[model samples]
Each structure stands twice: as structure tokens, then as C-alpha cells.
Target chain A: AKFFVGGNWKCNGSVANVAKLVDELNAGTIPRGVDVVVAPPFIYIDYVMQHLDRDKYQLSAQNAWIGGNGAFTGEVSAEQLTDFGVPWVILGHSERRSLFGESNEVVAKKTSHALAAGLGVIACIGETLEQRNSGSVFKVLDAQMDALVDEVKDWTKVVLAYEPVWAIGTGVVASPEQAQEVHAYLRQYCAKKLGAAVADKLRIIYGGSVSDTNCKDLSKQEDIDGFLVGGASLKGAAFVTICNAAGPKAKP
Target chain B: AKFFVGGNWKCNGSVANVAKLVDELNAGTIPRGVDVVVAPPFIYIDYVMQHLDRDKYQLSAQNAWIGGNGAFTGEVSAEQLTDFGVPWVILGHSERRSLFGESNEVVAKKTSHALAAGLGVIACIGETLEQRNSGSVFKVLDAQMDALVDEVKDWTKVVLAYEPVWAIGTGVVASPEQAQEVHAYLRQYCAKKLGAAVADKLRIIYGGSVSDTNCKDLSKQEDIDGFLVGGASLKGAAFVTICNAAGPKAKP
Candidate 1:
């Protein structure tokens, strides 16, 4: 499977910052083989679209809303996202889960609706520090997986991201070995429900405290297709480094 | 005091509908004495700002988010709204309260933060059907008012909208007397906290099933400063009529 790198700027960034970052991304070199996408906040999508390299990269909304296009106040619908030609949406981020009460079922519905609108979904799933510490990752993963499997009809447009809650903003990333184990287990779980070929084709990415030094080793793992990046993605050149670490090398 | 009219298109309208509505509003005559603002869904706020008559009318977002920009998915911050130059926001609507679980405290914070970010608030307050039926409208209003008053220091940027939950979108409006009673009481409630002069000067509008037919008489009432219109706002003529009803008449 080809590598995919997504820069989830999250709820951070301003127009001025975006302008500076846009220029940095333009000057930076990246591998042609890496499928790169950057998910900025919703308000900046149109503004970034006007500046970013539209050919080598795609834009994503850090979050996507479920339901149709009306009456869901404070929500910009998946249909609305797709209507603006925004190709991808990040759903089920840990922040929403822990802080905003986003349940597995809520994430499932959002995923289903986004795909139905012909927009790809970067469906995020993972266990919190407590769950990881208590050895309950499997149960947590099971609930998240079961709900997603039931909600998704077309898996082609779905990319699974496993972002450990504890590692997300704490400057502590999961060891490459640990992430590989989870990614392998997730594929095996999906293989049972969707058959081996489809599971093999699924690109399971990892996230949480993704640093420049560790990014390369993480990409070397068999199941770790790419990354759902955070804090580091805000830097244009720094973000490019993370992309190259996962991307195919240029030939002489 | 100059009357204020806010067209709350409320979870309705697509690009085509908005385009048509904008043209219709532009073609329609407006009375200059009215302080007119129309809130489209968040997605349409930008579109409306670009198309609507900026000189005569202002734009508002139906809801404002509670916190910072990052990691809080499916929420749009008031700062972001103002970043787009949207001048107003509607906070604590009953739909958000009943359907989405916005507590009084949540509403209060949203109000304070939106104001701090330099956005004017069309803050909504009212009793639910059950509470109103229980004859606890005053109590319900009291709790909601206390919460907002506790948080907001500047009353100039806030317009209090009394949208009785039972009346919103129900095709059953509060009778003019009923609406006047609550409006007067709300002003009195504010008087206790903000002083009588400030309460008297503040614009307290009425909402919940504010139709073009009833709007004229409602505007004729002493305490009814203007309206926060719902379904009828989608129609060009209907919305225009509602605006004109509260607007100053051209003298011979």
C-alpha cells in the first residue's frame, strides 16, 4: 500500500499563520509517492485552498458533522464539506471523545454520513491512557471497530487512524514496536469482518506526539502506513520532514 | 429606541436558496430606521456576507462555539466567526438547549467568550413547554438570566431574545400581551442587575413563531423592540414584510 501522511492542524492556526505555512509548504520538497493531505480548521479550508498546492496534496477538515445540511446549529455538514470539494474529513479525534463526549456510535454515524456524501473519512480510534494502563485496549478497540464496521458500507474511502489518547499532546509517543502491535491487531480484527484482501489493503496509520526523529522508524513498520500528525504539523518545513520520512525516496 | 430585526433562517437554506434569497433581499425595499441583521447557518454566513447588502444589513452566525480553535471538533469558535467579520451570533437557542444539551452555564460561557472576542450576541432565553406548562416560565427565565448576567459585563454587545420553547416553530406564537409581559419582566430582571436606565435602553427582541402576520401587531406593542424571526425569514417577501412592519414608515 502507498504511504499517506495527514497533517491534522486540529483547532490551532490563524489566517496569518496559515499564510506563512502555505509559503513554507510550497518551497519544501516532498516525495511524489507519498499521498499527502493537511487538515486545517474548517474556516481556513477555503482560504488554504486558494493558496496550497492542489496537485500534490489534498485538504481535510479537522472535523466533520453528521446529518443533512440544515438545523444542526454550529455544525458544518459533511455534505457542505464535500460541496466545497474538500476531499477528506477527520472524525472521532480523541479530544472530542474525552472532552466533548463523542461516543463510538456518534463517530460511526459521522463516518457513515461523510462517506455517503462521497467524501473520504480519516476515522480516528484509540484507547485512553487509563484503558492502556489497565490492559483494556482490546475491549476499547472492539467497541470502536464494531460500531465503525456496522456504519461503513464502502471501505475504499475510509482510512483508519489509531491515536493513543495518552500520547496525543503529552510529548510521549507510543514506541514503534507498540504501535506496530496495535496496527497489526487492528488489521487482523478487520480481516475477520472484511476478509484478508480488504484488510491487507486497509492503510492503518498511527498518531500522538509524532516527532521528527521517531517518524522515520515508525514508517519502517509494516502496518504503519503513515501518520495523523498534530503539534508538529503547524510548521511547514517540519511538516514536510515528517512527510518525507514516510514518503518514497527520490531516485538518482 | 430604533427597532432591531434579526432574520433567523435557522438550519435552513442551500447555496441556490441563499443566492435567490440574497437577490430577493437586494431587490426588496427596506426601511432605514430598522437595525436589520439576518443569521444564516454558519456555512452560509460567508456567502451571505459577500452577497447581502453590507451597508444596510449585517450577518450573524446561528451559534458560537465555547472555546479555543484546536482539537474541539464539530464546533466553530466565536473568534473564528468574527475573524470572518461576522458581526453577530445567536446563543442559547432552545433547539441547542433541548436537542444538543447546552446548559445555562455553557450558554453563559459562550456569551462571555463571544463578547470577549468582539462579536455581538443575540442571546436567547425562555422556558420549555414543560416548564411553561408548569407555570415556571418566570423561574426558568430567572435561572437563565442569572447565569448570563453573572458572566456578561458588557450589555451593549448583547441583544436579549425571548424565544419561548413551546412557541418556536410551533405555528403558535405568544399573544402580544403574553410576549409583552415577558419582555417587560425581562427588562425588569435586567434592571435589578444592570440599572433601570440601561435596561430601558437595551434592545429586547421577541422570537418563536414570529410570522409576518403577527409581527406587525407584535411590533406595535411597547416592550416588543423587534423580532428574531424563524421559518418566514426564508421567504423574500415574507421576511421583507416582517422587517418593514418593525421599520419606520416614510412620512409624507
Candidate 2:
């Protein structure tokens, strides 16, 4: 499995700043084997695509509609993303699941539709701080996985993202051990439920409060494939550092 | 008040089709005083703005985030709209209220934020079939109105869109009388609650199944100042016809 690093620039950037950031990304140094993807806000996707160095890093959308493109007002469809030549979409982010009321079923439905429309999906799953404190982390994570696994016919097209709800944008980075515990369980869960082949190949990346300061430690973990960066993504140098930290040990 | 006509190109269009539509729109005829606006999906906003004839019509976003641009994943903020030079945003659409779980408070907050961000707002409100069947149409509409009126600091920047939920995309349009009655009540509601000046100057536009075929009669009513066209807006010639149907009698 190649190291997959996705920069989800969630709800940020203007035309001026986006141009500058795209310039910074275009000039940044990412490792030869690392698969990097940057998700600009919907309004800036076209502009970013026109300027991004596709050979180094590709583009992704933060979200997509559950079904085909039609009367879903204010929504961008997965079919539309495929039509626009965007190759990937980040689905079921913790923010989307909690703040926006996206049920696990809805996430699965979106994942199914996106794959059918020929776009790769970074499917996010995680437990909140309360769920963790209550010792229901595995239970919450398993339920989320079950919903997605049922609809995901093709594992090759999906990248599982484990982002704990509490750590997201809270300036609280989960310890390497904490993140790996979830990542290892996720891989095992896939192996037991989906199949050995699916588990071996799936890229289970970590998200939520990932930064250059701590990425090297997180990247050292055996099960930690790469990262889905949040705030640090807006800083090109920091994001580049995080990408470079995808050490050889983690790459299968 | 100018006869306000807005085409909500809701969740529709590809790059090729959008370009062709923009070309058609640029070539179409509109009267001197009509306030014309077209809302492309978020992905297409920048592209449409670059190609659209600004002298003929203004651009609007289908929706905007309830507050400032920040950590909210998969949302485009109102502040970003101003930064992008988008002059308008449509909030409180029935689809958002019903499907996306946006409450009246959320809608009002969005309107307030959009206004503060220096963007005009097309605030949508109406009754579902069950509410209308149960004789609670006025009650429902009033609740929606009260929420907005409380937050609206500038009436001039807001155009009230009355889109009966059952009428939207169902190929069933409310009769002219049916539309006129609701519009009149809304104006009166504004008069009693907001002030006489606001009610007198308010532009109450009708939406849901508004087409060239029916736009003229709907635009003839005393309180119906214009239209918020849906399906017919996708067709250049049809939308042009609807815009021309903004009859003189409705202009305040």
C-alpha cells in the first residue's frame, strides 16, 4: 500500500489566498511514492485544478451528494465530481457526521454512489471523547465500519480515515499509540469482516489535529499508513513536512 | 422596488453545459429595470461569474455557511462570498430545511451573517402539504417570517421567496390567487411586525414551479413583486421569457 496523504482544507481560502497556497503546494517537495491529494473548497476547485501540479499531488472534494446529480439544492454530486475530472472525495468526516447530521447509512450510501460514479472515497470513521471515556470506542467504531463495509463493494476505491471527533480542531493531538490502537483495530476489523485481501491492501490513514510537529512520530507506527491533515494543510511547508514524514516502515 | 427575478440553478450543470448556458444567458433579452440574479451551484460559481454578463444579471450562491468561514468542514461561509465578490446568497430553502435539517434559527442566523458580510439575501419560506392541508399554512409562514424579521437589520437587502413545499419540483404550481393571498399576508405580517416602511418596500417573490407559462399571471398580483424560478431557469430562452414576464403592474 502506498502512503496516502490528503489535505482537507475544510471551509477555508479565498481567491487571492488560494492562488498563493496553490503556488506553495505546486512548489512543495513530496516523496516520490507518497500519494498526495489536496481538497480546496468547492468554489476554488476549478482554480486549484488549473494551477496544481497533478504529477506531484491530485485533487479531492470535501463531500458529495448521496445520489446522482439533480434537484439536491446547494449540493455537489459525486457524478459532477467525476465529470469535472476530480478523482477523489472525502466522505463521512467527523464534522459532517456530528455537526451536519450525516448518519452512517447516509455515509455508506454516499460512498457507494461515489465509487459507482468513478471517484475514490476517503471514508472517515471515529469515536468522540465521551465515547472513548465511556470505553465504547471499539463499539462506536465498529458500528460505523459495519455501515460502510456493507455498501463498499470495491475496497480498492476506498481509503479509510480514522479521525477521533474530540481531537479535531481542538488543538489536541492524539498520541501515536492512541491513533495506532484505532488504526490496528480497523485493519483487523476489515480482515475479519471483509476479507484478508481487503485488509492487507486498504490504506487506513489518521486525521484530526495532525501536524508537522507530531507527524513523524505518528508516521513511525506500523499500522499508520499516512494522514488526512486539517489546519496544518493551509500551511504548505508544514503540510510538505508531514508528507515527507511518511517513513519507509509504514509503507507496505 | 424593482421586479426581482432569480434563477436558482439548483444542483445542476457540467462545465460544458454551464458555459453554453452562460452564453445563452448573455445573449438573452431582459427589460431595463428588472433585478435579475442567477445562482449557480457552488462549484460553478467562479466559472459562471467569469463568463456571465454582469451588466445583465448578478450572481448568487445557492447557500452560505451560517457564520464566518472557519473549521466547519464541507461548508462555504458568508464571508467567503463577499471575498469572492458574490453579491447574493439564497438561504432557508425548503430542501435545506427538510432534507438537511436546517431550522428556522439556523436560517435566520445565516441571513444575519450574510447581510453582515455585505451580501444580499434571498430568504425562502413556505408551507408543506400537510401544514396547508391542516390549515396551518399561515401559522407556518408566520413562524418562518417572525424568525427572519427579528434578525433582519436591513430589509432592502432581503427578498422574501415564498416557495410552497408541495409546489416545488412537483410540476404543481399554486394558482395566482393562492400565491397572491400568501404574499399579501407576508407583507401585512411584515407591516405589523417589522414596520410599514419595510412592508411597503419589501419584494415578495413567488417560487416553486415558477415557469414562463405561469410567470406572467403570478407577477400580475398586487403583492407578488417577481419570481424565484426553478426548473425553467435551466433553459436560457425559458428563463428569458420568465424575466420578461416581470410585468409593469408588479413594479412598486
Candidate 3:
């Protein structure tokens, strides 16, 4: 499978800036053999979708409601996103789990709904520095995975993003060896739980403060599929470089 | 000033149905001296705005956030609404107040923000059956109004919608006398608080189970400026009749 690079434009960019950014991306020569997707804020999704090249880049909603249309105020449901032709939705992001009160069960439900709607799911699970420092990183990750194991019978539609909460937007980067260890563990967990065939196909991406500078070494790991970029995605040139780093021909 | 009638089409209608409904309204002959505005769900706002007659019919948002724009998830602020050419916003609806836990203070803040954004405010105030039973109807209304009065120094962009909680969607219409009493009380309160010129000029409308049958009687009251039709607005003919009932041609 080709290396996948996703940009989580977290609550950033005005409408005008989004167009300019898209124009710059359209004009620039992106790295070959890397799949890229940009997830913008919900309100600007359609605007960005209208401008982006469907073949080279894809679009995703930053968040989606698990429930179908009803009285859940201020929420756009996964079904609605699918109906609007939104191909992907990011579920259970660290910010959603920590900042907003999204429990694992809720994220699992969202995953089920998004899958049912035939939309690609970016199901994020992670550990904080506290959990990692106490040597409970695997245990915490196991618990988070357990929430989805029962609900997600098929893993084909889902992409797992392991974002360390402390490293995310904190200017602290996880060492290359540290990230690879967790990713390898995750692949093992998937192989055990979902069989070797499913594990081989599943993409385990890394996120949280991933920039052009460190992304090359991070992408060199055997288990690390790609990077889910945050701040660097807003800067067009840097994001392109990160995308290039994930490509096969790029140096380790 | 023309008699103001607003259709609060809250979370209703399919895409095709919305188009047909808008077409019906456009074709139907509306009475002279009446102003009509339709508030569709946020997703449908741009579509409806493009189709509707800007010269005759206006558009309003069902709810708007207090802030300019940031990470207040699942909300469209007044500035966003105004950016889309939505001239009016319905604030403090009973459903929003009770179900969404929007306090009077929050509604007041939203009203202030909406006004600052140069959007017209449909400020709703009401008393529950329990409060009315206890004969504190005027008191409840007074409390609701005071919240806005405290924050909003100028009432020029404001349209007061008195939607009694007991009467809404319950099939129990407020008696003309009961509604008129509150309407007069509201006007008197405004006159005392904001002076007679502002009070006389302000449009104090009645809501809550307002239909074609009862609207005629309610519209006869000198103080009843218009009607804020909720469920009945879904039906084009019925809504047009309600608008006509409040028109200048209707004898008081």
C-alpha cells in the first residue's frame, strides 16, 4: 500500500486563507507515491472540497456525531456527512477525548456509524505522558482498543492514528524509537485481534507535533504508515515536504 | 412599519421539499403591508437564501452563537450568519432555553453579539404554565426582558416574540385576551423602560400554537404587531394567511 499523509487543519484558516492555501497546493508539485488528505473545519469543508483536486488529495470532517439525525444540537452526524458526499471522518481525536468529554464507547459508536455510512474512518487512540512514564502505555492503548474491538467487526474502512496526548501541539516530539515501539505493538495487537490479513492492510499513522524536520526519520520505521500533521499543514511548503518525507524514494 | 411574520422552520423539510415549499411561497400572492422571513435549518440557509426573493422575503437563523468565531464547536455565530446575508436571528426560543440549557443571560449575550454584528434580533420571552398558574406570568416575562434590557442599550434592531411555553405545539392556544394582556404588558414595560417612542415603534409579536383560526382574533389587538408562526409555517397557505391576518387591510 502507498504511504498515507493526512493534514488535520485543526480549527485553523479563514475562508480566504483556505482558498489561497488550496491554490498554492494546486500550483505546487507534490511528492509522488504518497496519498494526502486535508481535514478542514466543518463549515469550510464544502468550500475546500470545491477547490481541491479529488485525484491527488481527499477531504475529511474533523468531527462527526455518532447518532443519526435528531435533536442532538450543534452536531453534524456521520450519516449526514456521507449524504453530503464527505468520504472520511476523524473519530476519537485526542482533543475530542481530553478536551471535549468523548468516551471510548462514544468513539466506537461513531466508528460503527461512519463505517455503516460507507465513509472512511480515522479512529484515533493514544496515551498521555503520564501513562507512558508509568510504563502503562500498552495497557492504556489496550483499553482504548478494547472499546472498538467488539463494535468494529471489519477493520477495512478504518485507519488508526496513535497520537501521544502530551506530544500533541506541545512542541515536544516523541523520539523515533519511542514512536516505532508503540506502532509495532499496535500492529501486533491488530494481528492478534483482527488476524494477519487484516493487520497487514490496516494503516497505523502517527500524529502530534509532526513537522517536516522530524517526519523523515519517523516515516522510515517499518510499522509507522505515515503522519497525521497538525500545525505544519497550515504552512503549504512545510506540509509538502512532510508528504515527500513519507514517500518511498525519500531517504530515511 | 409593516406587520412582521417569521416562519421558524426548525429542523424540518427534505432538500426537494424545501425547494417546492420556497417555490410555493414565491408563487403565492402575499398580502400588502406584511413582511415575511423564513428560518430554515443552517444547512439549508444558503440554498434557500439563493432561491428566495430578497426584495419581498428575508431569511433568519434559528440560533446564533455569542462569540465572533473560534473553537465553540457545533455552532454558527451571528457574524457567520450575517456573512451569508442572513439579516435576522431568532434568539431565546423556548426549545433552546429549556432543552439546550441556554440561560437568559446567555441569550442576552447572544442578542448583544448579534446586534453588534448588525443583524436583526428576534428576542423571544415566555412564561410556563406553572408560572402562569401562580400568576407570575408578567414576572417571568419581566425577568426575561430585563436580561436583554440590561445588556442591550438600544432596542431598535429587536423584535420581541412572546411564545408562552404552555401553549407551544400543545394544540392549546393562548386566548386572545391572555395573549393581548401579555402583549400590552410587554409594550407598557417597554414604554416605561425604553420610553414611549421606542415602545410604540417596537414590534411585539405573539407565538405559541399560533394558527390561521386564532391569528385573526390575536391580530385584532392594537398592541399585537405580528405572529411568529412555528409548526404551521411548514404549510405555505396557512403561513400566508397568518401573514395576511396581521396585514394593514385587516380591521383592528
Output the number of the DockQ-best candidate: 2
lDDT of candidate 3 over B1-252, digit per residue (tens): 668889888656555777888887777666767878888766567668888777668998888777676443335667777766789999988877876667789889999999998899999889887787798987788889899998898888899999878776456667889888889999999999899999998899887677878888888887888888887888887887788786563323
How close is every model to the real structure, measured as TM-score?
0.93, 0.97, 0.78
Sort every candidate by DockQ, greatest first: 2, 1, 3
Docking class of 3: incorrect
lDDT of 1 at B135: 85
Model 2, B90-150: lDDT tens digits are 9998889988988888999899989999999999998888788799987899899889978
lDDT string for model 1 (A1-252, tens) is: 668889988666665877899888888887877778998776677678778998667998877666876555556778777777789999998877776678999999999999998799999999977788898999999999999999996789899999878666666667889899999999999999888988988889887667687888898887888898887888988889988886453221
Worst 10 residues of 1 chain A by lDDT: A243-252
Ranking by lDDT: 2, 1, 3
For residues A1-252, what per-residue lDDT tens digits would candidate 2 score against the true structure?
889999999999988999889889888888778999999889899889889998888999999999986777799999889989899999999889988989999999999999999999999998887887799988898899999989987889899999977675456667889888888999899999889998989999999678989998888887888899999999998999998997783343
Decreasing TM-score order of the candidates: 2, 1, 3
TM-score of 1: 0.93
- For each candidate, the DockQ is 0.50, 0.81, 0.20
DockQ-superior candidate, 1 or 2: 2
> Which lDDT tens digits does candidate 3 get at residues A145-206?
98988789988878899987867546667788888998999999999999999998888999
Docking class of 1: medium
- The candidate, 2 or 3, that scores higher on TM-score is 2
Error of 3 at A241 (Å): 3.9
